Unconditional design. Sequence first.
Length: 162
Amino acid sequence: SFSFGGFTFKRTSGSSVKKEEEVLTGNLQTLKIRVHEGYEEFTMVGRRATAILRKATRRLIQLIVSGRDEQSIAEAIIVAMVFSQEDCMIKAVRGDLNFVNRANQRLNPMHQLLRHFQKDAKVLFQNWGIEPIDNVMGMIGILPDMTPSTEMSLRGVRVSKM
Ligand SMILES: CN1CN([C@@H]2O[C@H](COP(=O)(O)OP(=O)(O)OP(=O)(O)O)[C@@H](O)[C@H]2O)c2nc(N)[nH]c(=O)c21
Ligand SMILES: [Cl-]
Ligand SMILES: [Cl-]
Ligand SMILES: [Cl-]
């Protein structure tokens, strides 16, 4: 297992290899990130939310999340979206990320991205994409404004009851 964003990730299937890669933000800033290449499935376990995640290289395929309340579920979703390394997440950074402030000198770009969206996730959520759902019993869709829906949801994301 390993820890990212306050969650313990445990791989349940698949595998990956690591390599450094450049990516471009919405403000055309170049970031170097360690990309994981491979299809993998994980459990994500936090103190206030849990999830099942399926991902491929820089793609979130499925996230089923449950938790105490909207704030904890939203935080899990943010951590999963950043962890996915998806282009739409990188492109949702619309101004420059600061690496020079003394308090940011030991954050790698993945952790700079995470902090950015923890401060404010509106642009992330509005640019991720939505899809119609054929709602499954015991689950529900979640919209970009973090309200529930039986008709639409953030792409790949569903909320479960505890
Ligand atoms: C996206 N990540 C990140 N990650 C793991 O999550 C932790 C934090 O990721 P990170 O801070 O970018 O990577 P890390 O290699 O530790 O830092 P650095 O790039 O600065 O050397 C590490 O344990 C890393 O191996 C992952 N592990 C697996 N299996 N699959 C993945 O897609 C990813
Ligand atoms: Cl807690
Ligand atoms: Cl796929
Ligand atoms: Cl939190």
